[PDB]
């Protein structure tokens, strides 16, 4: 129950010990979801880094957004993934929104306020309820077993999630910075706990 | 008798079984026509895909808009075609309007709100009336005999047709998104029937 408007988390150096953990009040099995976030780093030309990592008892990576060297964004909703391609890389803050549903299996990778393509994946798979939502390092277990290679150094914020599939217009409003009501993870009112070397600072990005 | 404003058809994967079919009330032999549509895919760098396919009893391809690898748009009004060239390819939604008349045989390929050139073809040829307007795969017969290579994966919408030759200004208004009255196929009020894996979703493109 705290606000983080105009604030962002900063990871100064690479380390497999520093990370934040977010908690949610979800109780029912997720079937269709959407997420949005902003981040800023420069590790692209050096190695791969983990952007978003979920967690469940049975599977290490229920939902996972990662960056693969010379490949681009990789999005996994289970034991499968899509390989979204990015030809060139620049240095600047980046927004990214994604959505998925079990009924159809479609996915949309909204990047910088623009769409890429609709693609199909894991039609029928139902997501779990209990989670350990870590941020800072990808985990291969319930909040543990981190590898320093995937560690992220830089800053991130503006994280938000919904349990429904947003229409193609509310994404534009999110991109423009308007007022809306997340139902799972709300940046306006959030609960978290942090360990290691992490700091909170005004978002340098616009 | 249904509306599809702000909606679009989505083909998730490649398959020669999924397709939609549109019906029209035409009764007289078409002599001059015009069409307009919007589509979005990324198959250009991989193979050729069929954009629009007509059908008649005597000829498999009465009217056909196709994309040829490293060549560009190909437009056939019968046993003849024009080879419209596109030097470079990008990834983004695309509009395309075309028109033809039997009296003169001229053709205009309006792309992204811009013209290319006037060219001549099949002056005298009269089009048929009965049709099987398929969308999703090119057909070499009356609605049958599909080849998976030509299948389209992506999304498409905003389809409209007229039985006259529009002046160079109404095309601009179409491009800007204004209200007009198609006389053959009307996106505002349309009849269709779909088979296979196809979905209806809000148009991600603007």
């Amino acid at each position, epitope marked *: 129950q705290t606000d983080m408007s105009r604030k962002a988390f900063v990871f100064p150096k690479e380390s497999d010990t520093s990370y934040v953990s977010l908690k949610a009040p979800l109780t029912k099995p997720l079937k269709a979801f959407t997420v949005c976030l902003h981040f800023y780093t420069e590790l692209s030309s050096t190695r791969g880094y983990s952007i978003f990592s979920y967690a469940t008892k049975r599977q290490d990576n229920e939902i996972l957004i990662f960056w693969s060297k*010379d*490949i681009g964004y990789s999005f996994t909703v289970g034991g499968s*993934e899509i390989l979204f391609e990015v030809p060139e890389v620049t240095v600047a803050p980046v927004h990214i929104c994604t959505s998925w549903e079990s009924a159809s299996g479609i996915v949309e990778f909204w990047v910088d306020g623009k769409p890429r393509v609709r693609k199909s994946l894991k039609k029928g798979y139902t997501v779990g309820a209990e989670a350990s939502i870590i941020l800072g390092q990808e985990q*291969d277990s319930f909040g543990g077993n981190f590898e320093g290679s995937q560690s992220l150094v830089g800053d991130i914020g503006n994280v938000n999630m919904w349990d429904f599939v947003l229409s193609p217009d509310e994404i534009n409003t999110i991109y423009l910075g308007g007022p809306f009501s997340p139902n799972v993870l709300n940046w306006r009112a959030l609960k978290y706990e942090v360990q290691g070397e992490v700091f909170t600072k005004p978002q340098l990005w616009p | 008798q249904t509306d599809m404003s702000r909606k679009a058809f989505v083909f998730p994967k490649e398959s020669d079984t999924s397709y939609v079919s549109l019906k029209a009330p035409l009764t007289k032999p078409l002599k001059a026509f015009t069409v307009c549509l919007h589509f979005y895919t990324e198959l250009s760098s991989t193979r050729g895909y069929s954009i629009f396919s007509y059908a008649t009893k005597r000829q498999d391809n009465e009217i056909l808009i196709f994309w040829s690898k490293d060549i560009g748009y190909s437009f056939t009004v019968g046993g003849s075609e024009i080879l419209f060239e596109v030097p470079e390819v990008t990834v983004a939604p695309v509009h395309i309007c075309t028109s033809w008349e039997s009296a003169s045989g001229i053709v205009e390929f309006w792309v992204d709100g811009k013209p290319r050139v006037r060219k001549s073809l099949k002056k005298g040829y009269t089009v048929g009336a009965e049709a099987s307007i398929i969308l999703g795969q090119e057909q070499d017969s009356f609605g049958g005999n599909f080849e998976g290579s030509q299948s389209l994966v992506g999304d498409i919408g905003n389809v409209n047709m007229w039985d006259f030759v529009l002046s160079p200004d109404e095309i601009n208004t179409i491009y800007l998104g204004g209200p007009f009255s198609p006389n053959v196929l009307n996106w505002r009020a349309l009849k269709y029937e779909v088979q296979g894996e196809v979905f209806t979703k809000p148009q991600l493109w603007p």
Partner: nanobody
Amino acid sequence: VQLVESGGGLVQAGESLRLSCTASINIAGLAMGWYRQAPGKQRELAALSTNSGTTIYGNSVKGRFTISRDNAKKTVYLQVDSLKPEDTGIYYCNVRFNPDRIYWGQGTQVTVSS
């Protein structure tokens, strides 16, 4: 869980080469590719075939080889051409499903006769 390779090194400067790989698993939902490991440096990615109708290519070697995705079987191809001296080294090949699970291949060495 399994992997097999077929190819030869000792190739002359500029000529072609055909390498191949096989496994005991379907390729549906498995992006398969090739990585290069020259002396020193580090194991890098030559090029791979996406899951659905696309082929990523290593920036270093543009228009260098072809992914030649196999279907119904496991037989990846490169169609080497314009073999230059810098091509010498190990050529790893593997299929990775999801990050942290790639079941690394064994790779095959290739030399460049001057």
